[PDB]
Amino acid sequence: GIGTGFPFDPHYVEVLGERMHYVDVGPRDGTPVLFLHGNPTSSYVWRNIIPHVAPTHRCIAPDLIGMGKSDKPDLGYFFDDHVRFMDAFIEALGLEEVVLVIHDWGSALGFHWAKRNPERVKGIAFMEFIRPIPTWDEWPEFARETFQAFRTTDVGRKLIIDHNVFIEGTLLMGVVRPLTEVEMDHYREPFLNPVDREPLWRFPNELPIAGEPANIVALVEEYMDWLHQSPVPKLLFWGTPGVLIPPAEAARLAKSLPNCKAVDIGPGLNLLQEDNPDLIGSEIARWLSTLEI
Numbered sequence: 001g002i003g004t005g006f007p008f009d010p011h012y013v014e015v016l017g018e019r020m021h022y023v024d025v026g027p028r029d030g031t032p033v034l035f036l037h038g039n040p041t042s043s044y045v046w047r048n049i050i051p052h053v054a055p056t057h058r059c060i061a062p063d064l065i066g067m068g069k070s071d072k073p074d075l076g077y078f079f080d081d082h083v084r085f086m087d088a089f090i091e092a093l094g095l096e097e098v099v100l101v102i103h104d105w106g107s108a109l110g111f112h113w114a115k116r117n118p119e120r121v122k123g124i125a126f127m128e129f130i131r132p133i134p135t136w137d138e139w140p141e142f143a144r145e146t147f148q149a150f151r152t153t154d155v156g157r158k159l160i161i162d163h164n165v166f167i168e169g170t171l172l173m174g175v176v177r178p179l180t181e182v183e184m185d186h187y188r189e190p191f192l193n194p195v196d197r198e199p200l201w202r203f204p205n206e207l208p209i210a211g212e213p214a215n216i217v218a219l220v221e222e223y224m225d226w227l228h229q230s231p232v233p234k235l236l237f238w239g240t241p242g243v244l245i246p247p248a249e250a251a252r253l254a255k256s257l258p259n260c261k262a263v264d265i266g267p268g269l270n271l272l273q274e275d276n277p278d279l280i281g282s283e284i285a286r287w288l289s290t291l292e293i
């Protein structure tokens with residue numbers, strides 16, 4: 001069965017005066033592979049994928065600020081806050097050239113960093129990633145009223161902050177197979193106190209949907225314009241029915257994006273890592289062996 005443990009040695013680095021936790025396994029040299037999680041996860045989401053890559057490549061998986069085992073400063077946890085901390089995390093580790101493996105809000109971080117620093121990105125593997133959702137009709141109908149409610153300071157904070165709905169409900173509605181109690185306890189651990197749930201609420205309020213927020217829509221449009229032209233090697237994982245990326249969106253991206261290979265993982269919603277980790281890990285490792293890294 002799918003692994004529930006998190007065996008990785010903890011590593012911590014000071015970033016802008018705060019401690020960030022990260023996984024760091026595999027060989028010390030070579031080009032490192034940087035894994036970026038999203039909402040409401042942590043490096044735990046990569047726990048069954050990294051073991052396929054670590055035999056041949058260094059794997060670095062940070063917990064975003066305010067998440068996982070990273071510190072919890074009193075921030076708004078806007079996307080811009082995550083950009084500042086992730087930019088500084090990369091520099092604090094002395095990383096030069098990297099391969100990115102990115103998902104959900106980790107994909108917005110990774111694509112935005114890659115567009116700004118294309119000389120340092122030797123490949124991008126991505127899945128269920130952030131793109132502009134032009135209208136609410138392009139958000140999945142089964143989740144539409146709830147994401148609209150999440151994007152308010154009254155109803156949305158009651159759901160996400162007071163009642164932890166992004167962890168207890170949305171997370172499960174983002175995985176096809178059932179999560180176990182042990183897995184749920186790993187996902188719950190950073191958010192036992194309601195006040196620590198700010199990033200879980202700010203993230204859906206940053207999603208670029210129906211033109212709002214305009215600043216995020218613009219930033220995401222910019223990195224998508226880059227991705228449609230850049231020769232950077234690309235590996236796209238997708239599932240059915242998906243959430244952010246429906247199968248039809250995925251198949252077209254695969255042929256439109258330069259130097260891109262697409263991989264169908266089977267049934268999947270948002271956290272594709274929880275539905276088919278072994279295929280995602282083995283395909284990343286195979287694809288890495290084809291790169292000039």
Ligand SMILES: [Cl-]
Nearest residue numbers: 039203204207
């Ligand atoms: Cl979100």
